[PDB]
Amino acid sequence: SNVEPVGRLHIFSGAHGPEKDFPLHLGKNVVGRMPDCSVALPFPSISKQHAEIEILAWDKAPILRDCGSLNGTQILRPPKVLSPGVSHRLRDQELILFADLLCQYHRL
Amino acid sequence: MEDTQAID
């Protein structure tokens, strides 16, 4: 197909199982437990619709928003707890927690 | 799908 990834979300391996890599595309990339999510994370602590990474351009910082998750979305180095709907701009190599799951965003 | 499980 035609869509070209403009980013990558890495889900670290751990107690929940092996690592995963998800391509991120222009527009809205939904993170959640639903199999239809752009970034599907089939784990009990992840909300059905957990967060959204919106990418407007390959060379502009994405927008991360929590979608009213139960267990939260957080940014590390330094710690930051995201309020539902509020824009957070992602930097290259950003470490993100969706609930208890550690992830890392990469520019391509 | 079932409800999200709170971290306890």
CSV table of C-alpha atoms in Angstrom, one decimal:
chain,number,residue,atom,x,y,z
A,1,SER,CA,0.0,0.0,0.0
A,2,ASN,CA,0.9,3.7,-0.3
A,3,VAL,CA,1.1,5.2,3.2
A,4,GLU,CA,4.6,6.0,4.3
A,5,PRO,CA,5.5,5.9,8.0
A,6,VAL,CA,6.8,9.2,9.4
A,7,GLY,CA,7.6,7.8,12.9
A,8,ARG,CA,7.9,4.7,15.0
A,9,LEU,CA,6.5,3.8,18.4
A,10,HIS,CA,8.6,1.1,20.2
A,11,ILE,CA,7.0,-0.9,23.0
A,12,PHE,CA,9.7,-2.4,25.2
A,13,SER,CA,9.6,-6.1,26.2
A,14,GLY,CA,9.1,-7.0,29.8
A,15,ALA,CA,6.8,-9.0,32.1
A,16,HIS,CA,3.9,-8.6,29.7
A,17,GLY,CA,5.8,-10.3,26.8
A,18,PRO,CA,8.0,-9.4,23.8
A,19,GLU,CA,8.9,-6.0,22.2
A,20,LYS,CA,6.8,-4.5,19.4
A,21,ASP,CA,7.3,-1.8,16.8
A,22,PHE,CA,4.5,0.2,15.3
A,23,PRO,CA,4.7,2.6,12.4
A,24,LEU,CA,3.1,6.0,12.8
A,25,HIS,CA,1.5,7.9,10.0
A,26,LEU,CA,0.4,11.4,9.1
A,27,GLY,CA,-2.9,12.2,10.8
A,28,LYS,CA,-4.3,10.6,13.9
A,29,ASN,CA,-2.7,7.4,15.3
A,30,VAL,CA,-4.9,6.0,18.1
A,31,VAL,CA,-3.1,4.0,20.9
A,32,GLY,CA,-5.3,1.5,22.8
A,33,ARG,CA,-6.5,-2.0,23.5
A,34,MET,CA,-9.0,-2.2,20.6
A,35,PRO,CA,-7.5,-4.4,17.8
A,36,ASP,CA,-8.5,-1.6,15.3
A,37,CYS,CA,-6.2,0.9,17.0
A,38,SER,CA,-3.2,2.1,14.9
A,39,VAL,CA,-1.1,1.1,17.9
A,40,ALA,CA,-3.0,-1.9,19.4
A,41,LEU,CA,-1.8,-2.9,22.9
A,42,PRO,CA,-3.8,-5.9,24.0
A,43,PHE,CA,-3.1,-5.6,27.7
A,44,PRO,CA,-5.6,-5.3,30.6
A,45,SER,CA,-4.2,-2.0,32.0
A,46,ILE,CA,-4.5,-0.2,28.6
A,47,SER,CA,-7.7,1.7,27.9
A,48,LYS,CA,-9.8,0.8,24.8
A,49,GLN,CA,-9.1,4.3,23.5
A,50,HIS,CA,-6.0,5.3,25.5
A,51,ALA,CA,-4.2,8.1,23.7
A,52,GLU,CA,-3.7,9.7,20.3
A,53,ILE,CA,-0.6,10.7,18.5
A,54,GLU,CA,-1.4,13.3,15.8
A,55,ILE,CA,1.3,13.9,13.2
A,56,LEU,CA,0.7,16.9,10.9
A,57,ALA,CA,4.1,16.8,9.1
A,58,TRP,CA,7.1,14.6,8.9
A,59,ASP,CA,9.2,17.5,10.2
A,60,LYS,CA,6.9,18.9,12.9
A,61,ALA,CA,6.8,17.6,16.5
A,62,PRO,CA,3.8,15.2,16.9
A,63,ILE,CA,1.0,16.0,19.4
A,64,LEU,CA,0.3,13.4,22.0
A,65,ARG,CA,-3.0,13.5,23.9
A,66,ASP,CA,-4.4,11.2,26.5
A,67,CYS,CA,-7.9,10.2,25.6
A,68,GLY,CA,-9.3,10.1,29.2
A,69,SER,CA,-7.5,6.8,30.0
A,70,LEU,CA,-8.0,5.0,33.3
A,71,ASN,CA,-4.3,4.5,34.2
A,72,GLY,CA,-2.9,7.6,32.6
A,73,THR,CA,-0.3,8.6,30.0
A,74,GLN,CA,3.0,10.0,31.3
A,75,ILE,CA,6.2,11.4,29.9
A,76,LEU,CA,9.5,10.5,31.6
A,77,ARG,CA,12.9,12.4,31.7
A,78,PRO,CA,11.4,14.6,33.3
A,79,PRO,CA,8.2,13.1,34.8
A,80,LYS,CA,5.0,14.6,33.4
A,81,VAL,CA,1.4,13.4,33.8
A,82,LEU,CA,-0.9,14.2,30.8
A,83,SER,CA,-4.3,15.7,31.4
A,84,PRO,CA,-7.0,14.3,29.1
A,85,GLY,CA,-7.2,16.1,25.7
A,86,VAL,CA,-4.2,18.5,26.5
A,87,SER,CA,-1.5,18.7,23.8
A,88,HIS,CA,1.9,17.4,24.6
A,89,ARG,CA,4.6,17.9,21.9
A,90,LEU,CA,6.7,14.8,21.3
A,91,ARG,CA,10.5,15.0,20.9
A,92,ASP,CA,12.6,12.4,19.2
A,93,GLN,CA,13.4,9.5,21.6
A,94,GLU,CA,10.6,10.6,24.0
A,95,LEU,CA,9.9,8.0,26.7
A,96,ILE,CA,6.2,7.5,27.3
A,97,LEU,CA,4.2,5.4,29.7
A,98,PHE,CA,0.7,4.3,28.7
A,99,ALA,CA,-0.5,2.9,32.0
A,100,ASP,CA,2.4,0.8,33.1
A,101,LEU,CA,3.8,0.1,29.6
A,102,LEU,CA,7.0,1.8,28.7
A,103,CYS,CA,7.3,3.0,25.1
A,104,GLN,CA,9.6,5.2,23.0
A,105,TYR,CA,8.8,7.5,20.1
A,106,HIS,CA,11.3,7.8,17.2
A,107,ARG,CA,11.4,10.2,14.2
A,108,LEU,CA,12.2,8.5,10.9
B,1,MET,CA,-14.1,-5.7,25.3
B,2,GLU,CA,-14.0,-5.9,29.1
B,3,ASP,CA,-13.4,-2.8,31.3
B,4,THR,CA,-9.9,-1.5,31.7
B,5,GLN,CA,-8.2,-2.8,34.8
B,6,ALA,CA,-7.1,-0.2,37.3
B,7,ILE,CA,-3.5,-0.5,38.6
B,8,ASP,CA,-3.7,-1.6,42.2
